[PDB]
Design a protein around this ligand. Sequence first.
Ligand SMILES: [Mg+2]
Ligand SMILES: [Mg+2]
Ligand SMILES: [Mg+2]
Ligand SMILES: [Mg+2]
Ligand SMILES: [Mg+2]
Ligand SMILES: [Mg+2]
Ligand SMILES: [Mg+2]
Ligand SMILES: [Mg+2]
Ligand SMILES: [Mg+2]
Ligand SMILES: [Mg+2]
Ligand SMILES: [Mg+2]
Ligand SMILES: [Zn+2]
Lengths: 118, 108, 148, 308, 152, 287
Amino acid sequence: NTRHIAFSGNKWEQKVYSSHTGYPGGFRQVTAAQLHLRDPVAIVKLAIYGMLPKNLHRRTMMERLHLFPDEYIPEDILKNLVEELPQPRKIPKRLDEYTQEEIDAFPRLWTPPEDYRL
Amino acid sequence: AAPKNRRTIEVNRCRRRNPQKLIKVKNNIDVCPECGHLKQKHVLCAYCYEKVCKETAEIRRQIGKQEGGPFKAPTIETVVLYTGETPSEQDQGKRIIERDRKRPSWFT
Amino acid sequence: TARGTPSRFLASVLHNGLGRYVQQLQRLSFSVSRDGASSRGAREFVEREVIDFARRNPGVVIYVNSRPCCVPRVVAEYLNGAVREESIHCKSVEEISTLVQKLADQSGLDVIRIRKPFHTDNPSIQGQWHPFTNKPTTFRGLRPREVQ
Amino acid sequence: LHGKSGTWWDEHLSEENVPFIKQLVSDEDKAQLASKLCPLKDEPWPIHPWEPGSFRVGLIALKLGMMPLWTKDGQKHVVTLLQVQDCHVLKYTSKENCNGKMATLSVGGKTVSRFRKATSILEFYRELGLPPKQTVKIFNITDNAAIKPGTPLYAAHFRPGQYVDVTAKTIGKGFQGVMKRWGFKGQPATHGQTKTHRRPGAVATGDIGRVWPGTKMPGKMGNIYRTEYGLKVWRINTKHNIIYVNGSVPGHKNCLVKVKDSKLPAYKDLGKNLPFPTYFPDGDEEELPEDLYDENVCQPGAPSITFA
Amino acid sequence: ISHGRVFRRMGLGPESRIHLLRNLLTGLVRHERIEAPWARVDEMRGYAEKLIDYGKLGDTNERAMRMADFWLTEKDLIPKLFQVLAPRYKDQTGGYTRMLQIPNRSLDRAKMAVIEYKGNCLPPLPLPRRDSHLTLLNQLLQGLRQDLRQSQ
Amino acid sequence: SPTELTEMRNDLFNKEKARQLSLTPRTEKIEVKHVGKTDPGTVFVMNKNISTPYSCAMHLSEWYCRKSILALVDGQPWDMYKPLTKSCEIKFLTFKDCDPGEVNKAYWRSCAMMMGCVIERAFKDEYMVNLVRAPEVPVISGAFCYDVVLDSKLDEWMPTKENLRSFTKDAHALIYKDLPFETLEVEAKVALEIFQHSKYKVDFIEEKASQNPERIVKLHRIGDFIDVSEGPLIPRTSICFQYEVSAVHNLQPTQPSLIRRFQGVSLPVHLRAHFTIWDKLLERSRK
RNA sequence: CCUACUUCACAAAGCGCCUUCCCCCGUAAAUGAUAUCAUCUCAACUUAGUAUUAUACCCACACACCCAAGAACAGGGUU
RNA sequence: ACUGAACUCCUCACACCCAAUUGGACCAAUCUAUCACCCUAUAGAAGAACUAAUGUUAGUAUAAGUAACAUGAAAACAUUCU
Ligand SMILES: [Mg+2]
Ligand SMILES: [Mg+2]
Ligand SMILES: [Mg+2]
Ligand SMILES: [Mg+2]
Ligand SMILES: [Mg+2]
Ligand SMILES: [Mg+2]
Ligand SMILES: [Mg+2]
Ligand SMILES: [Mg+2]
Ligand SMILES: [Mg+2]
Ligand SMILES: [Mg+2]
Ligand SMILES: [Mg+2]
Ligand SMILES: [Zn+2]
């Protein structure tokens, strides 16, 4: 589900990935949103690549990294899986997801005047 | 431009022991079934060619003795005959070059 | 340097301390000159200290040659077969005494870099860590995202 | 003696057997080619109708040469002759394995000797039941246009007025200096110039202390694949399988060119009237004339054009 | 670029190339067998064939006579060309010469060739002979030939 | 068990080998003169009944060793590994001689024998296979044949293409093993003792002992496989390069037992055939 | 790229001929709260608004001679 | 909170981290005295120690098997031809 990552703040629009093709005029700067639309794995791959130690083992390590844009995973990879790591960020619930019991449990904060359009 | 640093023996070995520089093994060498000599497939057997060249040189020395002078190329065919050979019917009217040795087996 | 030198692991000869301690030095051979200032200290050692050392170390056979070759020496042969030759050239009596005692207390193993200051044949009692220690199991051993 | 001797088919054949083998193998080749002459009677794959967005297969033709041509407006167009020589579909691969998301048809042409091909290629063509082809080119197609491997293709697979793209290896000019390769101005002939008339000038600036990748430098020119887009098909000789393509085509005479429907946007949906899967002579719906002409072509034999 | 260039660049130029080939051809006409660097023999083979054709054209043909006069530096060979070589090949239409590769020249290791006019009086060259028809492969192929002849 | 049969046959083979070697002890220098066209007049002094035409080739050069397939010792074809007996004239025959007919026949017999080994060690244990004979067919016939009687449990079974390809793969495994062709001139008595079980081989041995003046028979072994040879064989199995078991035709007149003729075709390293020519030869080797 | 023309001549060239395909964003609007009007919105939201270049190109594991391939090597052809 | 030095503590040991300069303890090899007579000792001496002077001489590398150089042709090796 690397396609469904979430960026805090306006990083989708502000974070810029810079590359150079080597040729003159070959400097390419692409926002995170554009890079994500192009490759749904690039953002996570680049984050991991930047966090890994900058030595010759880094690409051997990156060979052990398997990124899949969506829920689908190859059968052999699935059979290899051993453990699932807890998600680092707990996803906040939406109102549509809150139960009526929970809504009721939360107190009403204020008395709205009756004569108000709302 | 002059070299900026002496090239090490390690670099030099990597260069001058490259396969591109190594001599390639030839695989077109075989044995001449006639005489059993080594030859390349597309080239004439060296030994057989040497035989033919020596015999040709002897025949040409005889031709030169017969002609006796520059610019004496005959206007008629030539036939080489060895000891114990006689001009055949078709050998008539052709200059005869006589060789003192016997007819070589490879010469027909 | 370590990279330019051989290295070994800490070890004893035959588990030298488990059942009993066996002195690994078994032979000392002192080649000493009757004449020559180089072996004056060795001569004094033979006169004043070799007998006491011998009776202190009954397991070590000590030979005194009184006819050296190229320098006065002490050759120490250990049970494991190692032979350590030390020149006693121009050494005082006390220097020779300390050197001989060092040879006596030392084992035949090479004096090279020792990789670890410790050596356990049984490093683990509770079980060496493997990735599955501390990992909980799941019902029917179902791997993550497994349908059944 | 080491055992890596390089052998050719004739090496151990006797004088009597050489001509016999030549004749036998040539007869087999022509028999195999004839066996495929009737594809529609050989379990043809479903022939779907044309739909918008459908891409059909192309051909592999041989550049015969060039000749002039005149249009009814009186203008002369140089046209190049592309002969389809034993062009057949050889292989079909699906979107998944096409290295993309569009089916692929391999097409070969210009049958060549079997004595000069690698064992793997010979086995592939033996399974296909065809003599080996000089070049195999891959065409991206939609599944609508899939054609059973082994089916022949003909010049009439195209039609006059169509626009086509022709890709081929350009003429190889070897290592060429910068003046000929990139059209550099060079340096003056006289006025003092010493030993610099055709040389590259400065190759970079002093600051970067290197040469940028992609700098134009002397090197091998030509002998690379180039495509000419949007060439009009002026005429088709069905008898000899000749396509008359407007203008110039890359590569030398007698070189194999890959010919396909033009990809230019202006000609996006002109495939309505073209034979969608391919032209099937075996279909025999209407035996085509010997020459199909575009409307504007001044056909030879017509009365002399008068601009009345 | 030398696309379609059929003539080697030899000697000191075009005239020198013609003269070199002319000397080789005169030697060939005189001796009926010549050793020379492979490339020069290859270049001169076409000229040798053309001379045989010109000699076939006839002694009385002025153009053939002029061509022979130019191409044979020793003029005693012109009667030979018009009265020995041309009559010898009157039956044939081509392939008057036989060119074979020879072991590289010892001097400079040059690729060497021997070119002869077919039918000369000299001892035959050790020509390459194909495998005997009685070999295993050739017999199997003869079996194929007989079976094909019978079946079809 | 078949393994025990092979073991005991090999034991008898080695016993006869040692017996003949002992019968010929010490070293008696026999003069063998090279009468071949090339290197004429050379003489090899050789160890009687120990040295071989292969040893003479080794003396001559490596080209002779690699190219020589048979020997005409005193005008008779001798296997390159068959010990020389008496002073003689020797000439080495290759595959490319002007008249290689003898070499072709020897190659044909050796290929048939290899096929026989493959056949006998191919089928599953339960089925029983009886190697009747290697009929002597001309090379023009296009395929060397080996006759075998399979079990009644298989008389209704015809090999599939995959079975035939497995036979070819086994033959190529044998070629890769490159086992020398061992020979023995063995009297009919010991030959019959070795082949007591195989009735077909017993009667063939009787036929051969009748044909020849004495009761001397030609036994040949590649490895663990011993068979009666109609004549001299190839030195080694690596001489074969292209080898294919092409077909199995059931002989029409089979009332008592069903004789299946395994047909195959081979070409040596010296005479490799291009892929297409080989395919045509394969096609014609299925008749 | 060579059909013509021209330099030329079994071919290389231009002075000759042939082919060349989507955009980028500054603003202008819709509904609408904070601030019940209004408000294009670093409010939620709806358009102009699109790069996520579209493609095309290339894709056959395994002597000698000739070549439009080529410095060598490599490449293609030899049915 | 933790991390964090050659700081400090800890076990053991301590003369053992500046330029110029200065003080000092040792010392390779050589020769001499006298020893030793084995390859050393105590002394007296001195052409008494070389990773460095575009150092001197010699050797051999690198550049590099590179730049460069050379034989008109055939032939009967007589000769002829260009
Ligand atoms: Mg200019
Ligand atoms: Mg100039
Ligand atoms: Mg030159
Ligand atoms: Mg710390
Ligand atoms: Mg401190
Ligand atoms: Mg000094
Ligand atoms: Mg020094
Ligand atoms: Mg110096
Ligand atoms: Mg050098
Ligand atoms: Mg250089
Ligand atoms: Mg040079
Ligand atoms: Zn020869």
